[PDB]
Every structure is written in C-alpha cells, then in structure tokens.
C-alpha cells in the first residue's frame, strides 16, 4: 500500500488516474473584457480548479502519508505553480495563446485588459514554447506536476520535532521515485543515458522558472485583490494569504 514500492509504470498509472476533471469557464461572457471581468473569470476558474486540486493531491502517491498540517503546507506553497504548469501544458498546441479552459483561449493582447497581466502572460507563453521545443510528453508532465506538489514547500516547513524530519525524508524518497519514473520513461522512449540525464535536468530547470512565475503571479493577484477589483472565494484567499503569512 506504499508509494515507495511502486514500479515506474505503476507510478505513471497512479498519476494519470489522479487527474482532475476538465473544467469550462463561466458560459457566455460580455464583449469586450474589462480589468474586473477578466480577473473575475480567471479567479473563478482558479478557485474551481483549486477545489479539484485537493482531490488530485490526495491521489498523488505518498501525499496522504503526510500529516494534515504538512499536506496543507505543500498545497499552500505549490497551488499557483500547479495551476500554471497545467495552463502551460494545455497551451502547447496554441502558439501565442493561453488555453485557460477549452472555451477560454486568450492571446497576449487580451492580457493587456488587466494592469500588469501581459508581463505574466509573456512568461507563461515562453514556458509553453519551451515545452513544445522539448516535445514534453503527457507522462512527463504528470511527473513534473507531482514534483511541484512535493518539492515546493519541502524547504519551508517549521522544525516540528523529529516528525518534521521523518516527513521531509518521506517526501524526498517519493521525489526520488518520481525521478526514477522520469528516467524510465526516457529510457523506454529510446534516449541514451547522456540524453536521459540532459532531459531530466532541462525539465527540472524549467521548474525554477515556474516558481518565479508563481511568485510574480502572487504579487499580481494580491495587487488586484487590494484594488478591490475582484471578489475571491475563501479557498483562493487562504492559498494567497499563505504567501503573506
């Protein structure tokens, strides 16, 4: 019943099965986009995705073995990085555009409807372009998203005794299993050992850019919140506030 006894194939199957439902943006919005209407659509979508993210995280091998306090910390840390990697993945087949949902495809100029948004859209578009150049596969994407969940908040727990040490060790062992899984997928695809290590490094280095985008996205959302332009649900509010606490 342990995440640490899974084969690379069982890990991929568990991650694919964990996938949240596909959501559509709120039906028939008025034309054109105002700063308030664009922010409202994007945050309503983000809050609905966050509800399903909780269920997804509970299905990620090793997550439910952690304490409730630690599960809360990992999610509060990683939420926006996870929303962004999902967005970047969905947008790979739409050059120059972001597929927020199947009925919500935005171009960079539509990003200009919200102050400070176009700069974030550009970083997201660049990540989507990078994933396309790398020909990122679905099985690799699910490994990366689970790496974000487990890694993002792992260096920022308190020192909650020896239990905190046990928890961090557990997370690092699950992350090691995910590395083994990515390597297996690359080996099965016919990549040489040198190409396998090179590709693993390239994928993991992109996670540093996703972290940067999440920090910028966080500052932007807080600024939109403060200006009284967007109403927010408590789940999204709690996730955002964890980065101000």
């Amino acid at each position: 019943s342990l995440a640490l006894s899974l084969t690379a194939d069982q890990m991929v199957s568990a991650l694919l099965d964990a996938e949240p439902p596909i959501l559509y943006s709120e039906y028939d919005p008025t034309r054109p986009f105002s700063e308030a209407s664009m922010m409202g659509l994007l945050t309503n979508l983000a809050d609905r995705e966050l509800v399903h993210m909780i269920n997804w995280a509970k299905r990620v091998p090793g997550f439910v073995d952690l304490t409730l306090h630690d599960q809360v910390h990992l999610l509060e840390c990683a939420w926006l990085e996870i929303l962004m990697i999902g967005l970047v993945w969905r947008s790979m087949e739409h050059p120059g555009k972001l597929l927020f949902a199947p009925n919500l495809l935005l171009d960079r100029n539509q990003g200009k409807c919200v102050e400070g948004m176009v700069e974030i859209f550009d970083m997201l578009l660049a990540t989507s372009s990078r994933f396309r150049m790398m020909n990122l596969q679905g099985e690799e994407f699910v490994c990366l998203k689970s790496i974000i969940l487990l890694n993002s908040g792992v260096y920022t727990f308190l020192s909650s005794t020896l239990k905190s040490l046990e928890e961090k060790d557990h997370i690092h062992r699950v992350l090691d299993k995910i590395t083994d899984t990515l390597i297996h997928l690359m080996a099965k695809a016919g990549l040489t050992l040198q190409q396998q290590h090179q590709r693993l490094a390239q994928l993991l280095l992109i996670l540093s850019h996703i972290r940067h985008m999440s920090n910028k996205g966080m500052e932007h959302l807080y600024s939109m919140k403060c200006k009284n332009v967007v109403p927010l649900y408590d789940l999204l509010l709690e996730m955002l506030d964890a980065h101000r606490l």
Binding site: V51, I54, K58, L68, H69, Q71, V72, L75, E76, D234, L235, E238, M239
Partner: peptide, 11 residues
C-alpha cells in the same frame, strides 16, 4: 487555516 485543513480530512 481551517477551510483547507477541513477539506483535506474528509472521505
């Protein structure tokens, strides 16, 4: 921190 902590505990 209640909402997230409560939503994680159920099933």
């Amino acid at each position: 921190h209640k909402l997230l902590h409560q939503l994680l505990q159920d099933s």
